[PDB]
Amino acid sequence: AANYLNIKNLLDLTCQTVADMIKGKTPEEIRTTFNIKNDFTPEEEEEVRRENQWAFE
């Protein structure tokens, strides 16, 4: 489901369950099951993880 036309309740229906795809999955598990391609030089993809786990978790 896309939409154009704005059926606000149903956005809520898909989003809540796509979101449900994601919760409790690594950035890989997501990126795999989804086919986003990792666009992080592993220097940035590692400064970011250190911030995440050291400061926000």
Partner: protein, 567 residues
């Protein structure tokens, strides 16, 4: 997708998951920082205001903790740190839309509270959990200015008691109060203001009172607040009279939505049974300050079949708990506090048979905190055999280095059983006579453990070494007066980076080893908190008083006082 993602992300609210999505693509990192509502900062010194304000610029809610836990044991002297001001001041002009600030063990001051008040128009939630350094003047300012305050929660703080006047500054146009927890205030608020306040607050849902609010007046506030979900009483003593008992009783049955009860200071047994219409819908009960003997607690607990949480003094007793065991099949968390600890003298008959009972009896017991004076590996073995689902277990035996009193053996197989059988044990706090052998159990078995607290245990660094070596999930490790030092500590140096903090006080970690570690480990701050004067004024090999290590992306801190050294 795209603005869809914005909508998909709103469904995700765990920090872990938010962090996870931030790491899935540069685009996701970006949509995410933009639409993140809350930040959790477990350690105020692990990152800096500006770094936070600059990732995450649309933040509505901020949670921050300062001092390590053993600050409750008076093991971190005054001035150490924890100042919250830099955060308030940073967010003060970036965080226009800011709604909640929850702080744990921080220094917070009247100009902090002023600034919060003056700068956050939509401000709603203030929880100051074991903070210090403000006064009722600061509270005044918040009352006078925050026109949408929904929660003012002061659990467990040292307030400067300037006076109860502060509560009257809430204007008459103020109605939005949802939660008010003033149990730590000694200052006596004005009963008229307060009553007038409860009445114009239709959404007041949790009200927790100070001692100075005498039992006689309880009834009146309750008839004004019949929607309360939780209540904490005030003083709970009085001349025994039936007008009084009766007004209480009626007032209480008036609140059909109460689930939580506490307070009960100086409680008079005569006046507890009023709480009984309430009893049977009741999920949390806290009788910590009620010094009321066993039979009395047991009359009260008999009619709480729905009870999920119970904190109680130890005045309940073994018989007490044998009752709880048959009675509250739904009990989840049990905390027995000690009734008089500096006396070595069983004044109550609370032993380990209690804990053992409870644990056969409540299939959902998963969290325990328990002070007895005596223990056995037969008890722990049984406790562990019965509660494989246990997730938090703190035990605290009053005599230190006390051994199993039947075998004289120390408690290692004891706690071995716990760690081996509660495969989710996520927090563990130890005591009794204990040798390096327990740590071997811990490091082999405690694989989900995240928090471990230890005092007067262990034989050599071998102990600490199985712990940093074995415990995959370790986040907080904190230790006092054990024979643990340089070796385990440098042997496992990089574990310290997968952990949030390590705290060691009266151990034998030499100043030499502290120094080395700081240099091996630019990114940890290794802090020597020691009050005898500079450490280099003593030979490298002398144990520091305390050292506290923790990872940070901010590098070393700016507000150390004089008795703290960074490395």
């Amino acid at each position: 997708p795209e603005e869809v993602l914005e909508h998909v992300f709103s469904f995700i609210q765990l920090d872990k998951d938010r962090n996870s999505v931030s790491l899935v693509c540069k685009s996701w990192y970006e949509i995410e920082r933009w639409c993140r509502r809350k930040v959790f900062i477990g350690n105020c010194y692990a990152v800096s205001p500006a770094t936070v304000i600059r990732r995450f610029p649309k933040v509505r809610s901020v949670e921050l903790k300062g001092k390590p836990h053993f600050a409750d044991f008076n093991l971190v002297p005054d001035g150490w740190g924890g100042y919250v001001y830099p955060w308030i001041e940073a967010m003060s002009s970036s965080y226009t839309w800011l709604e909640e600030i929850r702080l744990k063990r921080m220094v917070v001051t009247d100009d902090c509270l002023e600034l919060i008040a003056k700068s956050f128009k939509n401000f709603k939630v203030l929880v100051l959990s074991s903070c210090e350094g403000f006064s009722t003047d600061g509270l005044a300012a918040i009352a006078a200015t925050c026109r949408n305050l929904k929660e003012l929660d002061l659990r467990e703080s040292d307030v400067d008691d300037v006076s109860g006047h502060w509560l009257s500054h809430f204007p008459d146009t103020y109605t939005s109060l949802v939660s008010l927890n003033i149990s730590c205030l000694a200052s006596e608020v004005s009963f008229s203001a307060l009553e007038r306040l409860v009445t114009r607050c239709p959404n007041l849902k949790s009200l927790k009172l100070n001692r100075a609010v005498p039992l006689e007046k309880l009834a009146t506030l309750l008839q004004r607040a019949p929607q309360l979900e939780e209540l904490g009483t005030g003083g709970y003593t009085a001349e025994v009279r039936p007008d009084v008992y009766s007004g209480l009783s009626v007032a209480l049955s008036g609140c059909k939505e109460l689930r939580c009860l506490s307070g009960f200071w100086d409680a008079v047994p005569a006046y507890l049974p009023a709480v009984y219409s309430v009893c049977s819908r009741l999920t949390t009960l806290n009788l910590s300050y009620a010094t009321v003997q066993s039979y009395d607690l047991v009359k009260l607990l008999c009619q709480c079949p729905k009870l999920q949480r119970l904190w109680v003094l130890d005045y309940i007793e073994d018989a007490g708990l044998e009752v709880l065991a048959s009675t509250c099949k739904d009990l989840r968390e049990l905390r027995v506090f000690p009734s008089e600890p500096f006396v070595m003298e069983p004044n109550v008959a609370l032993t380990e048979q209690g804990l053992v009972s409870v644990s056969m009896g409540c299939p959902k017991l998963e969290s325990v905190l328990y002070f007895c004076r005596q223990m056995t590996n037969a008890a722990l073995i049984t406790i562990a055999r019965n509660r494989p689902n246990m997730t938090r277990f703190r035990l605290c035996i009053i005599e230190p280095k006390a051994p199993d009193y039947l075998t004289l053996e120390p408690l290692d197989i004891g706690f071995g059983a716990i760690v081996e059988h509660c495969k989710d044990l996520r927090r563990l706090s130890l005591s009794g006579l204990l040798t390096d052998k327990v740590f071997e159990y811990i490091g082999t078995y405690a694989k989900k453990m995240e928090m471990l607290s230890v005092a007067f245990a262990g034989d050599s660094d071998l102990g600490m070494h199985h712990v940093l070596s074995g415990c995959d999930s370790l986040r907080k490790l904190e230790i006092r007066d054990c024979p643990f030092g340089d070796k385990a500590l440098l042997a496992n140096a990089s574990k310290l980076e997968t952990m949030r903090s390590l705290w060691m006080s009266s151990c034998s970690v030499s100043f030499g080893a502290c120094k080395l570690l700081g240099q091996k480990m630019p990114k940890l701050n290794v802090e020597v908190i020691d009050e005898r004067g500079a450490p280099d004024s003593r030979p490298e090999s002398c144990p520091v008083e305390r050292v506290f290590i923790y990872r940070t992306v901010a590098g070393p801190r700016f507000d150390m006082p004089g008795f703290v050294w960074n490395m």
